[PDB]
Design a protein around this ligand. Sequence first.
Ligand SMILES: Nc1nc2c(ncn2[C@@H]2O[C@H](COP(=O)(O)OP(=O)(O)OP(=O)(O)O)[C@@H](O)[C@H]2O)c(=O)[nH]1
Ligand SMILES: Nc1ncnc2c1ncn2[C@@H]1O[C@H](COP(=O)(O)OP(=O)(O)CP(=O)(O)O)[C@@H](O)[C@H]1O
Ligand SMILES: Nc1nc2c(ncn2[C@@H]2O[C@H](COP(=O)(O)OP(=O)(O)O)[C@@H](O)[C@H]2O)c(=O)[nH]1
Ligand SMILES: COc1ccc(/C=C/C(=O)c2ccc(OC)c3c2OC(C)(C)C=C3)cc1
Ligand SMILES: [Ca+2]
Ligand SMILES: [Mg+2]
Ligand SMILES: [Mg+2]
Lengths: 428, 437, 334, 54
Amino acid sequence: MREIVHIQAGQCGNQIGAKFWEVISDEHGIDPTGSYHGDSDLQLERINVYYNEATGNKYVPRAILVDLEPGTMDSVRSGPFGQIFRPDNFVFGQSGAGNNWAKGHYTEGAELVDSVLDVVRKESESCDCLQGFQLTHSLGGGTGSGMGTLLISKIREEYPDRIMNTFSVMPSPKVSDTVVEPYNATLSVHQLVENTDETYCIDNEALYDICFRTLKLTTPTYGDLNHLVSATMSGVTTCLRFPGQLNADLRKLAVNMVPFPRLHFFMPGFAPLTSRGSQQYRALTVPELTQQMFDSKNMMAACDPRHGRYLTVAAIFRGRMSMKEVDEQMLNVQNKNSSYFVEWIPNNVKTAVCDIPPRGLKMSATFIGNSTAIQELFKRISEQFTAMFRRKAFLHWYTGEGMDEMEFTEAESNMNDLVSEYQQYQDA
Amino acid sequence: MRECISIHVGQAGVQIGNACWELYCLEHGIQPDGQMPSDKTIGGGDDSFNTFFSETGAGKHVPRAVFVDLEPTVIDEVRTGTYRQLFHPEQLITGKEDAANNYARGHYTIGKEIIDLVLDRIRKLADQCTGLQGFLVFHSFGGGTGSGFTSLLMERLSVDYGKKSKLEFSIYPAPQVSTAVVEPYNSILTTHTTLEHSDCAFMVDNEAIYDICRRNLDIERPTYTNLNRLISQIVSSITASLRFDGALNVDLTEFQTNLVPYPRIHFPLATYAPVISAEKAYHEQLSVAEITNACFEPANQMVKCDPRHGKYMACCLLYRGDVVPKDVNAAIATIKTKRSIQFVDWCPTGFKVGINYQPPTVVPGGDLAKVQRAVCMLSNTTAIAEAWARLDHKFDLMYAKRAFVHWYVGEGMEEGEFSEAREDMAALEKDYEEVGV
Amino acid sequence: MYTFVVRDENSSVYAEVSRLLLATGQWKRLRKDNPRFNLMLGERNRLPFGRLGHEPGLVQLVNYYRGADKLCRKASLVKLIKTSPELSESCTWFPESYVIYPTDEREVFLAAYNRRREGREGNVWIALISSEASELLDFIDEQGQVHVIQKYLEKPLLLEPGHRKFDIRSWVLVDHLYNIYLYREGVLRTSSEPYNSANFQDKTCHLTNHCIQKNYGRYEEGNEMFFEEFNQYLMDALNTTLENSILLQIKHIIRSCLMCIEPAISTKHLHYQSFQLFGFDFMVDEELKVWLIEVNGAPACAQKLYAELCQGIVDVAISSVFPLATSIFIKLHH
Amino acid sequence: MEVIELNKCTSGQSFEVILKPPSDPSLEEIQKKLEAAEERRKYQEAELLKHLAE
Ligand SMILES: Nc1nc2c(ncn2[C@@H]2O[C@H](COP(=O)(O)OP(=O)(O)OP(=O)(O)O)[C@@H](O)[C@H]2O)c(=O)[nH]1
Ligand SMILES: Nc1ncnc2c1ncn2[C@@H]1O[C@H](COP(=O)(O)OP(=O)(O)CP(=O)(O)O)[C@@H](O)[C@H]1O
Ligand SMILES: Nc1nc2c(ncn2[C@@H]2O[C@H](COP(=O)(O)OP(=O)(O)O)[C@@H](O)[C@H]2O)c(=O)[nH]1
Ligand SMILES: COc1ccc(/C=C/C(=O)c2ccc(OC)c3c2OC(C)(C)C=C3)cc1
Ligand SMILES: [Ca+2]
Ligand SMILES: [Mg+2]
Ligand SMILES: [Mg+2]
């Protein structure tokens, strides 16, 4: 269980994906040309997880860049780290998906999908032991949403015994491109519920609110939102990328986080919350990290954890600190707030400490929670969906691409089922 | 002379295996290259250490050990480690992908594709034996390989070597050190499949070892190395009588005879004293009376439980160091009057004592101080059922909601096996209850 | 904030203890099945002692002592006194008692029954109270359960005016460090009907239990005479104090019984800790000699004394282990 | 009280001290059970590949 194949799809998928490779290449000591210029041997011990060995010691990201529009992918190639990516792994169409799920899934995306799978297959054949796949995408547009889920469905056919992992960006009227985003998201969730092992629910509502209420930025751009995304993406992958007490892989994470196969939607969280450029000079104490990471204000999904119960929790502390104090604080939170953790999964919180801190911070904490509070996110999408769907509004964009009204009704039903499934274990 | 084969399964089994073989080598004066200066019969012999070591014409002493993990990482550190020359690569078996904390994945899925290879390498060691008596099996209850594969191995060893004894060294799961949340599932599943196939099993609760390291070794946050060096001392004490001249527990069959009258109730409690920090300046050396008294303190046991609220069936005292029979009997007499020691009506109230004059060996630079005298007590008490009750309650909490069950079923297992394994455990808890009060 | 669980619904004492803890604003009650507690107010039967003291980052305490049933079950109490060297076969404060099973020490019982026949003296026993042994043995086999046959105290001390029988109840709290705390306030559970010497058939004047009495409440409210009034009666009618004539023997019996079981039940070096409230039942004869009847595992308090005793339990048994933001007990020294 | 079975040597000594007197499946069945789970796995993958083909 070594190699992970990273796929990034659509505008959002490629933009957060580029930031991910930018951040982790700095952490592993790789420059924008592919050469290792780090000082610690601990940086290279698990580099094969995300990077492919090359002649001359060059390191290349195991990354496939997918879009139906060439626009965003040219922005990556001309961007800060764009030269590092294997040029063949740039797979693009010309027309675009026009924020339409049907175009991504059924028409425009179908034309391009086999080309991506040829690049996937070529990357998979190099692998000593392929761990699985991770996708970065939004659920509100057309490519990342529609084509992204078409890829997942096709990958699961060719590799049925591998882990499927997503970083899925949830749409919000606060950071909105089109009115059809709740349609695109509901159709995507329907696919994610069936075809993924793990989904990190990154809510654009939450990322806006963190930028507005906490980071003090009055009008935040996508860059400020993606700073929060990439920092969370760094933290959740730390254990896969670095040696620790545990030999950490995607399957072990799935076995331990997912008690019931449909309930695999995770609330990410980060501490401390930082804005771009400007640095905090005071390092947080271990009690401060523990209090903040469990705080709702630090959650990447706009759900109040006090409205639900925690099924399973994974926490990761980064930096040189007392592992005894980490254990003491983690146990303190559980014993002070025992009602918010299900009694029917004993010892549902696991904690790891990595010595290497991320760029700019001396010590930090990353939170991964399978809470029943995530239902609020799915209810919000469901409410926005129904408001339009009861009048069959904007539906002609989808019926014109061959889709039936029944498929919308089915997707509405499955998501509402997921909501009631999460509600079942909140009261149990 | 009758040879013993050690099998080390999964991470816990392998790393504890490494800790033990390191200690055995220091005890018998065997160097990391395998040369033993004190050994005079070059390339042969049937001495007491030959139970655990075979020989080559060159003069190398090779362990009768097989290391097996479904994942390369851990055994790769044995292949590259300071004891690389000691083993031949055929003894060290690795897979590609691990059992992902899943009993069913280790038993059914990944178990099937490696079982025949492992038994072949075990047969390779068994053919070198003039009269093999059986197997010592090292594993964890909690891990997928440790639970799943070990139970399939125990199934097959009973078929291929029906005449031979099988002893277990098992790591009972503790939340302070645990890898996975499904460890109660794996523990119950593996015990059910292994119960008929195991003659004697020594449970080691990671919680007990952890807290001993905090209290007595002054280690703030114990690592596996801290735990394993301590576990290896206890294992060494138990195996000492097979590796040295003596008359108590000389073969593996005697472990059954001395400690196990009821075949299902084959889990002796181990207690060890004394555990003293090496970085402790000025230590008053503890006497025979003091260390024997410490064998009846719950804080020194390998599993936390209360022997006062239970009954004994057997009791072995194994001393290492400056100990004479007179001091032992004096100690026993004082302890009997001052403590609650109750035996079952169908057993003699008494102790079987073994003394080895060589003081315990500690690894140089380790956390344990050199002591003049030490003792391991092995007692078959009904009190150890507390550990089964703890584990069963955690199992019942998860299984009532059918949590995580789909991972096991997804690997080919049936939901019925969960309740079958739990019914056997419920039967075992009743067995201890009847004998108990 | 400390956390506790309630697993005894019927416990009138610990219902008041749970009430007082919440009112301090420093204790929170959890669900029965929640393992993440500091304190447990446990069930009377099948209490899961094996599950306690296995929660990292929690000091755990329970309101029962594992093994205390030896003192609290009638059959075991007889066995403990007869076998324990500390107590001795010859115990001055314990009535001659024998353990009898239904279809055992029947031959030892009958041989002692002959001594009262050879000397021709008081040969009355308690199980119902009967004079002949051949009528008592039929009752034990008729019920099914194991019963204790005990020498009945034919000549007890009787309160005036009324010629009334009584028993003394003492409340004792053993803490986590095995300090033995006797509560300064005891109670006399009194008979209302005059004591009958020849007629053992009538059960109201012979048995002094609060439930059986409910003549009721004639001399004192709810047939309960407290420690201030009883001391005064002894001062006037007998020229002695309660402290001298009765209480020194009581302190001797309590201390003797609990010192005996200390090595078997102590939680000094255990992973979990225990306290317990005990109810000791005593009997005073005409010559002012105190006899032990039974020990109670889950005793009920007298109504007047609930407020003070339950605060006492919190003060020395609970808050000593879990400190917050004069004494009502007498410590029995050992 | 009674010290019996005393055996001595250079390495050490052993003895008993008495204080008070008293008052399998076959190779065929394993291969069958293992294959029965392999069949149940293959049925689950087939029902997955059937659903995906739809
Ligand atoms: N005492 C001790 N316990 C260990 C050690 N390694 C793992 N454990 C414990 O064993 C349990 C996990 O089992 P592992 O042996 O790691 O799993 P495995 O057998 O490698 O199987 P996989 O699931 O395939 O990884 C947990 O309870 C750990 O705390 C060790 O070196 N010493
Ligand atoms: N040996 C004896 N001699 C004289 N009176 C006795 C006696 N044994 C019992 N009694 C009387 O019978 C009554 C019942 O006591 P006993 O202990 O047998 O029942 P019990 O268990 O219901 C007491 P409690 O209600 O406190 O639990 C006592 O109040 C006492 O006065
Ligand atoms: N957080 C974040 N969200 C984005 C970004 N770009 C687009 N989005 C969101 O994604 C949705 C539109 O998807 P997009 O990726 O542009 O469409 P696609 O190119 O067809 O996949 C909207 O809900 C936007 O709010 C980005 O860079 N960061
Ligand atoms: C108590 O519940 C648990 C929850 C999760 C685990 C995970 C074990 C892992 O192997 C693993 C894999 C990937 C990871 O990065 C996302 C992590 C990870 O686990 C740690 C604790 C090391 C932290 C993160 C076990 C139990
Ligand atoms: Ca030799
Ligand atoms: Mg867009
Ligand atoms: Mg492993």
